[PDB]
Design a protein around this ligand. Structure first.
Ligand code: HEM
Ligand code: HEM
Lengths: 168, 156
Protein backbone atom coordinates (compact mmCIF):
# COMPACT_ATOMS: atom_id res chain seq x y z
CA UNK A 1 0.00 0.00 0.00
CA UNK A 2 1.03 3.62 0.54
CA UNK A 3 2.08 5.55 3.66
CA UNK A 4 1.01 9.16 3.40
CA UNK A 5 -2.50 10.08 2.37
CA UNK A 6 -2.84 12.05 -0.87
CA UNK A 7 -5.67 14.42 0.07
CA UNK A 8 -6.09 17.70 -1.75
CA UNK A 9 -7.83 20.28 0.40
CA UNK A 10 -6.98 18.54 3.67
CA UNK A 11 -3.85 20.62 3.23
CA UNK A 12 -5.15 24.16 2.59
CA UNK A 13 -4.93 26.95 5.17
CA UNK A 14 -2.05 25.45 7.14
CA UNK A 15 -0.08 28.68 7.03
CA UNK A 16 -1.76 31.41 9.07
CA UNK A 17 0.37 34.47 9.88
CA UNK A 18 -0.36 38.20 10.11
CA UNK A 19 1.45 41.39 9.12
CA UNK A 20 3.61 41.24 12.29
CA UNK A 21 5.44 38.34 10.62
CA UNK A 22 5.40 39.44 6.97
CA UNK A 23 8.90 38.13 6.18
CA UNK A 24 8.25 34.61 7.51
CA UNK A 25 5.77 34.18 4.70
CA UNK A 26 8.57 34.76 2.18
CA UNK A 27 10.72 32.37 4.21
CA UNK A 28 8.13 29.58 4.16
CA UNK A 29 8.02 29.91 0.38
CA UNK A 30 11.79 30.13 -0.02
CA UNK A 31 12.17 26.63 1.48
CA UNK A 32 9.22 25.16 -0.41
CA UNK A 33 7.33 24.69 2.87
CA UNK A 34 3.64 24.95 2.02
CA UNK A 35 0.25 23.34 2.65
CA UNK A 36 1.24 20.05 1.06
CA UNK A 37 4.49 19.96 3.04
CA UNK A 38 2.95 20.78 6.43
CA UNK A 39 0.28 18.15 5.91
CA UNK A 40 3.15 15.72 5.32
CA UNK A 41 4.70 16.77 8.62
CA UNK A 42 1.37 16.16 10.34
CA UNK A 43 1.24 12.57 9.03
CA UNK A 44 4.74 12.01 10.36
CA UNK A 45 4.03 13.41 13.86
CA UNK A 46 2.60 10.13 15.20
CA UNK A 47 5.75 8.44 13.99
CA UNK A 48 7.94 11.03 15.65
CA UNK A 49 5.99 11.00 18.89
CA UNK A 50 6.37 7.23 19.11
CA UNK A 51 10.15 7.49 18.97
CA UNK A 52 10.65 10.88 20.64
CA UNK A 53 12.22 9.34 23.73
CA UNK A 54 15.03 7.85 21.68
CA UNK A 55 15.25 11.05 19.61
CA UNK A 56 15.85 13.10 22.75
CA UNK A 57 18.13 10.51 24.38
CA UNK A 58 20.40 10.52 21.32
CA UNK A 59 20.25 14.29 21.43
CA UNK A 60 21.74 15.05 24.87
CA UNK A 61 24.07 12.10 24.54
CA UNK A 62 25.45 13.83 21.47
CA UNK A 63 26.02 17.09 23.33
CA UNK A 64 27.89 15.09 25.94
CA UNK A 65 30.76 15.48 23.48
CA UNK A 66 31.27 19.18 24.20
CA UNK A 67 31.78 19.55 27.96
CA UNK A 68 30.84 23.23 28.02
CA UNK A 69 27.38 22.47 26.63
CA UNK A 70 26.73 20.07 29.52
CA UNK A 71 27.95 22.72 31.92
CA UNK A 72 25.55 25.27 30.46
CA UNK A 73 22.80 22.72 30.94
CA UNK A 74 23.51 22.10 34.62
CA UNK A 75 23.98 25.78 35.44
CA UNK A 76 20.36 26.47 34.40
CA UNK A 77 18.37 23.23 34.59
CA UNK A 78 19.03 19.53 34.04
CA UNK A 79 19.12 16.78 31.44
CA UNK A 80 15.85 15.31 32.78
CA UNK A 81 13.98 18.62 32.78
CA UNK A 82 15.42 19.58 29.39
CA UNK A 83 14.57 16.29 27.70
CA UNK A 84 10.99 16.93 28.84
CA UNK A 85 10.65 20.29 27.15
CA UNK A 86 12.47 18.96 24.13
CA UNK A 87 10.12 16.04 23.58
CA UNK A 88 7.49 18.75 23.58
CA UNK A 89 9.09 21.27 21.23
CA UNK A 90 9.97 18.54 18.76
CA UNK A 91 6.37 17.28 18.87
CA UNK A 92 4.96 20.64 17.85
CA UNK A 93 7.35 20.84 14.89
CA UNK A 94 5.22 18.21 13.14
CA UNK A 95 1.95 19.85 14.14
CA UNK A 96 1.31 20.80 10.54
CA UNK A 97 0.27 24.35 11.27
CA UNK A 98 2.37 27.47 11.16
CA UNK A 99 0.92 30.58 12.81
CA UNK A 100 1.94 33.64 14.83
CA UNK A 101 1.79 31.59 17.99
CA UNK A 102 4.22 29.14 16.41
CA UNK A 103 6.79 31.84 15.52
CA UNK A 104 6.69 33.76 18.79
CA UNK A 105 7.51 30.55 20.69
CA UNK A 106 10.67 30.25 18.61
CA UNK A 107 11.51 33.88 19.42
CA UNK A 108 11.21 33.00 23.09
CA UNK A 109 13.49 29.98 22.91
CA UNK A 110 15.83 32.07 20.76
CA UNK A 111 16.03 34.65 23.53
CA UNK A 112 16.52 32.02 26.23
CA UNK A 113 19.43 30.38 24.40
CA UNK A 114 21.18 33.72 23.83
CA UNK A 115 20.93 34.75 27.50
CA UNK A 116 22.42 31.49 28.81
CA UNK A 117 25.25 31.84 26.32
CA UNK A 118 24.61 29.03 23.85
CA UNK A 119 26.93 29.76 20.91
CA UNK A 120 25.04 29.60 17.57
CA UNK A 121 27.47 27.12 16.07
CA UNK A 122 26.56 24.56 18.72
CA UNK A 123 22.90 25.14 17.87
CA UNK A 124 23.10 24.13 14.22
CA UNK A 125 25.12 21.08 15.17
CA UNK A 126 22.35 20.01 17.46
CA UNK A 127 19.96 19.70 14.50
CA UNK A 128 22.32 17.47 12.52
CA UNK A 129 21.60 14.89 15.23
CA UNK A 130 17.86 15.37 15.12
CA UNK A 131 17.71 15.06 11.31
CA UNK A 132 19.91 11.98 11.26
CA UNK A 133 17.92 10.40 14.05
CA UNK A 134 14.68 11.11 12.21
CA UNK A 135 16.07 9.95 8.88
CA UNK A 136 16.52 6.54 10.41
CA UNK A 137 13.10 6.50 12.07
CA UNK A 138 11.63 7.07 8.65
CA UNK A 139 13.76 4.69 6.57
CA UNK A 140 12.67 2.08 9.06
CA UNK A 141 8.96 2.92 9.28
CA UNK A 142 8.44 3.96 5.66
CA UNK A 143 9.27 1.19 3.15
CA UNK A 144 8.31 2.75 -0.19
CA UNK A 145 11.52 4.48 -1.45
CA UNK A 146 9.85 7.54 -2.97
CA UNK A 147 7.75 8.38 0.14
CA UNK A 148 10.90 8.13 2.29
CA UNK A 149 12.41 11.09 0.41
CA UNK A 150 9.05 12.82 0.72
CA UNK A 151 9.27 12.57 4.50
CA UNK A 152 13.00 13.38 4.59
CA UNK A 153 12.43 16.52 2.51
CA UNK A 154 9.59 17.80 4.70
CA UNK A 155 11.67 17.53 7.87
CA UNK A 156 14.82 19.19 6.49
CA UNK A 157 12.48 22.02 5.55
CA UNK A 158 10.88 22.43 8.98
CA UNK A 159 14.33 22.09 10.59
CA UNK A 160 15.77 24.84 8.37
CA UNK A 161 12.94 27.13 9.46
CA UNK A 162 13.76 26.27 13.06
CA UNK A 163 17.28 27.56 12.53
CA UNK A 164 15.94 30.56 10.63
CA UNK A 165 13.63 31.60 13.42
CA UNK A 166 16.00 30.91 16.33
CA UNK A 167 18.71 33.20 15.02
CA UNK A 168 16.51 35.67 13.17
CA UNK B 1 43.10 11.02 7.06
CA UNK B 2 41.00 13.55 5.14
CA UNK B 3 41.08 15.93 8.08
CA UNK B 4 44.24 18.02 8.47
CA UNK B 5 43.22 20.57 11.06
CA UNK B 6 45.87 22.00 13.34
CA UNK B 7 45.16 22.91 16.98
CA UNK B 8 44.25 26.34 15.59
CA UNK B 9 40.82 24.83 15.09
CA UNK B 10 40.38 22.40 17.96
CA UNK B 11 36.71 23.34 18.28
CA UNK B 12 36.07 22.55 14.63
CA UNK B 13 37.32 19.03 15.39
CA UNK B 14 34.58 18.69 18.04
CA UNK B 15 32.02 20.01 15.56
CA UNK B 16 33.10 17.36 13.05
CA UNK B 17 32.50 14.59 15.59
CA UNK B 18 29.17 16.04 16.69
CA UNK B 19 27.86 16.21 13.08
CA UNK B 20 29.46 12.83 12.47
CA UNK B 21 31.64 14.02 9.61
CA UNK B 22 34.67 11.73 9.42
CA UNK B 23 36.83 10.01 6.79
CA UNK B 24 33.89 7.79 5.87
CA UNK B 25 31.44 10.64 5.22
CA UNK B 26 34.13 12.64 3.41
CA UNK B 27 35.06 9.71 1.16
CA UNK B 28 31.39 9.62 0.30
CA UNK B 29 31.48 13.32 -0.47
CA UNK B 30 34.54 12.94 -2.68
CA UNK B 31 32.80 10.23 -4.72
CA UNK B 32 29.78 12.50 -5.05
CA UNK B 33 31.89 15.36 -6.41
CA UNK B 34 31.78 14.20 -10.06
CA UNK B 35 28.01 14.36 -9.93
CA UNK B 36 27.95 17.77 -8.27
CA UNK B 37 30.05 19.14 -11.16
CA UNK B 38 28.18 17.88 -14.23
CA UNK B 39 25.19 19.53 -12.58
CA UNK B 40 26.86 22.53 -10.97
CA UNK B 41 25.46 25.04 -13.44
CA UNK B 42 21.84 23.97 -13.04
CA UNK B 43 22.29 23.71 -9.29
CA UNK B 44 23.61 27.26 -9.12
CA UNK B 45 21.33 28.79 -11.73
CA UNK B 46 18.49 27.47 -9.61
CA UNK B 47 19.96 28.73 -6.39
CA UNK B 48 19.85 32.25 -7.77
CA UNK B 49 16.42 31.68 -9.28
CA UNK B 50 14.85 31.12 -5.85
CA UNK B 51 16.17 34.38 -4.44
CA UNK B 52 13.28 36.35 -6.03
CA UNK B 53 10.86 35.45 -3.21
CA UNK B 54 12.68 38.34 -1.55
CA UNK B 55 13.65 41.39 -3.64
CA UNK B 56 16.13 42.61 -1.03
CA UNK B 57 18.45 39.64 -1.60
CA UNK B 58 18.63 40.33 -5.35
CA UNK B 59 19.26 43.98 -4.54
CA UNK B 60 22.14 43.20 -2.19
CA UNK B 61 23.82 41.34 -5.06
CA UNK B 62 23.44 43.93 -7.86
CA UNK B 63 25.08 46.43 -5.58
CA UNK B 64 28.02 44.56 -4.07
CA UNK B 65 28.52 42.54 -7.25
CA UNK B 66 26.61 40.92 -10.11
CA UNK B 67 24.77 37.69 -10.76
CA UNK B 68 27.50 36.33 -13.04
CA UNK B 69 30.26 37.08 -10.54
CA UNK B 70 28.31 35.41 -7.77
CA UNK B 71 27.63 32.29 -9.85
CA UNK B 72 31.31 32.06 -10.71
CA UNK B 73 32.02 31.91 -7.00
CA UNK B 74 29.12 29.65 -5.99
CA UNK B 75 29.98 27.15 -8.69
CA UNK B 76 33.55 27.16 -7.45
CA UNK B 77 32.63 26.99 -3.73
CA UNK B 78 29.92 24.29 -4.01
CA UNK B 79 32.34 22.03 -5.97
CA UNK B 80 35.07 22.44 -3.36
CA UNK B 81 32.55 21.28 -0.77
CA UNK B 82 32.82 17.81 -2.21
CA UNK B 83 36.61 17.70 -2.25
CA UNK B 84 36.47 15.22 0.62
CA UNK B 85 39.22 16.70 2.77
CA UNK B 86 38.75 19.61 5.13
CA UNK B 87 42.00 21.20 6.28
CA UNK B 88 42.96 24.62 7.74
CA UNK B 89 42.51 26.54 4.47
CA UNK B 90 39.03 25.12 3.97
CA UNK B 91 38.06 26.55 7.34
CA UNK B 92 39.56 29.98 6.63
CA UNK B 93 37.77 29.97 3.27
CA UNK B 94 34.48 30.02 5.15
CA UNK B 95 35.68 32.84 7.41
CA UNK B 96 36.17 34.92 4.26
CA UNK B 97 32.52 34.28 3.39
CA UNK B 98 31.20 35.22 6.78
CA UNK B 99 33.16 38.49 6.81
CA UNK B 100 31.81 39.55 3.42
CA UNK B 101 28.24 38.36 4.06
CA UNK B 102 28.13 40.71 7.02
CA UNK B 103 29.57 43.73 5.21
CA UNK B 104 27.13 43.43 2.33
CA UNK B 105 24.31 43.00 4.83
CA UNK B 106 22.95 39.47 4.42
CA UNK B 107 20.70 38.54 7.35
CA UNK B 108 21.48 35.16 8.91
CA UNK B 109 17.91 34.05 8.22
CA UNK B 110 18.00 34.41 4.43
CA UNK B 111 21.48 33.02 4.30
CA UNK B 112 20.20 29.91 6.08
CA UNK B 113 17.07 29.42 4.00
CA UNK B 114 19.30 29.61 0.97
CA UNK B 115 20.94 26.26 1.70
CA UNK B 116 17.56 24.56 1.55
CA UNK B 117 17.10 25.35 -2.13
CA UNK B 118 20.59 23.97 -2.54
CA UNK B 119 20.02 20.83 -0.45
CA UNK B 120 16.92 19.95 -2.42
CA UNK B 121 18.92 20.31 -5.66
CA UNK B 122 21.45 17.77 -4.56
CA UNK B 123 18.75 15.49 -3.18
CA UNK B 124 17.02 15.63 -6.58
CA UNK B 125 20.17 14.70 -8.52
CA UNK B 126 20.81 11.72 -6.21
CA UNK B 127 17.25 10.34 -6.35
CA UNK B 128 17.74 10.32 -10.12
CA UNK B 129 21.28 8.97 -10.17
CA UNK B 130 21.34 6.51 -7.28
CA UNK B 131 19.14 3.43 -7.37
CA UNK B 132 20.18 1.63 -4.20
CA UNK B 133 18.23 3.21 -1.33
CA UNK B 134 21.21 2.73 0.95
CA UNK B 135 23.62 4.56 -1.33
CA UNK B 136 20.80 7.10 -1.62
CA UNK B 137 20.72 7.81 2.08
CA UNK B 138 24.47 7.44 2.50
CA UNK B 139 24.87 10.31 0.01
CA UNK B 140 22.08 12.35 1.59
CA UNK B 141 23.44 12.29 5.12
CA UNK B 142 26.95 13.29 4.04
CA UNK B 143 25.55 16.24 2.13
CA UNK B 144 23.51 17.25 5.15
CA UNK B 145 26.62 17.22 7.35
CA UNK B 146 28.96 19.24 5.11
CA UNK B 147 26.11 21.67 4.52
CA UNK B 148 25.47 22.03 8.27
CA UNK B 149 29.21 22.41 8.88
CA UNK B 150 29.21 25.43 6.53
CA UNK B 151 26.32 27.02 8.38
CA UNK B 152 28.34 26.57 11.56
CA UNK B 153 31.47 28.07 10.06
CA UNK B 154 29.87 31.13 8.56
CA UNK B 155 27.94 31.64 11.75
CA UNK B 156 30.36 31.30 14.65
C1 HEM C 1 18.75 22.34 18.38
C2 HEM C 1 17.96 21.82 19.47
C3 HEM C 1 17.43 22.66 20.42
C4 HEM C 1 16.13 22.95 20.57
C5 HEM C 1 15.06 22.82 19.48
C6 HEM C 1 15.98 23.51 21.90
C7 HEM C 1 14.78 23.87 22.47
C8 HEM C 1 14.64 24.42 23.72
C9 HEM C 1 13.39 24.87 24.25
C10 HEM C 1 12.04 24.79 23.55
C11 HEM C 1 13.65 25.39 25.47
C12 HEM C 1 12.62 25.86 26.50
C13 HEM C 1 11.95 27.20 26.17
C14 HEM C 1 10.95 27.65 27.24
O1 HEM C 1 10.89 27.02 28.32
O2 HEM C 1 10.22 28.64 27.00
C15 HEM C 1 15.07 25.24 25.68
C16 HEM C 1 15.70 25.56 26.86
C17 HEM C 1 17.03 25.33 27.13
N1 HEM C 1 17.91 24.78 26.22
FE1 HEM C 1 17.57 24.33 24.45
N2 HEM C 1 17.20 23.65 22.53
C18 HEM C 1 18.11 23.17 21.61
C19 HEM C 1 19.47 23.13 21.81
C20 HEM C 1 20.12 23.47 22.98
C21 HEM C 1 21.52 23.18 23.24
C22 HEM C 1 22.59 22.71 22.25
C23 HEM C 1 21.71 23.38 24.56
C24 HEM C 1 22.86 23.10 25.28
C25 HEM C 1 23.82 24.13 25.59
C26 HEM C 1 20.44 23.84 25.09
C27 HEM C 1 20.25 24.19 26.40
C28 HEM C 1 19.08 24.65 26.93
C29 HEM C 1 18.93 25.11 28.30
C30 HEM C 1 20.02 25.18 29.36
C31 HEM C 1 17.66 25.53 28.43
C32 HEM C 1 16.98 25.95 29.74
C33 HEM C 1 17.53 27.27 30.32
C34 HEM C 1 16.91 27.64 31.68
O3 HEM C 1 16.33 26.75 32.34
O4 HEM C 1 17.01 28.82 32.09
N3 HEM C 1 19.47 23.89 24.11
N4 HEM C 1 15.68 24.65 24.59
C1 HEM D 1 24.01 28.75 0.14
C2 HEM D 1 24.50 29.94 0.79
C3 HEM D 1 25.50 30.73 0.25
C4 HEM D 1 26.77 30.34 -0.02
C5 HEM D 1 27.30 28.92 -0.03
C6 HEM D 1 27.49 31.55 -0.36
C7 HEM D 1 28.83 31.58 -0.70
C8 HEM D 1 29.52 32.72 -1.02
C9 HEM D 1 30.94 32.75 -1.38
C10 HEM D 1 31.89 31.58 -1.50
C11 HEM D 1 31.24 34.05 -1.62
C12 HEM D 1 32.62 34.62 -1.91
C13 HEM D 1 33.44 34.87 -0.65
C14 HEM D 1 34.82 35.44 -0.94
O1 HEM D 1 34.91 36.48 -1.63
O2 HEM D 1 35.83 34.84 -0.47
C15 HEM D 1 30.00 34.80 -1.44
C16 HEM D 1 29.86 36.13 -1.77
C17 HEM D 1 28.68 36.83 -1.79
N1 HEM D 1 27.45 36.28 -1.46
FE1 HEM D 1 27.22 34.51 -0.66
N2 HEM D 1 26.67 32.66 -0.33
C18 HEM D 1 25.44 32.14 0.02
C19 HEM D 1 24.26 32.85 0.01
C20 HEM D 1 24.11 34.16 -0.35
C21 HEM D 1 22.84 34.83 -0.50
C22 HEM D 1 21.45 34.26 -0.22
C23 HEM D 1 23.11 36.06 -0.95
C24 HEM D 1 22.22 37.13 -1.04
C25 HEM D 1 21.37 37.32 -2.20
C26 HEM D 1 24.54 36.12 -1.13
C27 HEM D 1 25.20 37.19 -1.64
C28 HEM D 1 26.56 37.28 -1.78
C29 HEM D 1 27.24 38.47 -2.26
C30 HEM D 1 26.59 39.80 -2.63
C31 HEM D 1 28.55 38.19 -2.26
C32 HEM D 1 29.67 39.18 -2.56
C33 HEM D 1 30.47 38.87 -3.82
C34 HEM D 1 31.37 40.03 -4.21
O3 HEM D 1 31.97 40.64 -3.30
O4 HEM D 1 31.49 40.33 -5.43
N3 HEM D 1 25.15 34.97 -0.73
N4 HEM D 1 28.96 33.98 -1.05
Amino acid sequence: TAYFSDSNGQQKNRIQLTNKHADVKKQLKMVRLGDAELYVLEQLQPLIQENIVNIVDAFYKNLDHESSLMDIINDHSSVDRLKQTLKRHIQEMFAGVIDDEFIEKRNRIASIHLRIGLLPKWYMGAFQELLLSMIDIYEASITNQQELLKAIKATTKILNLEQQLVLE
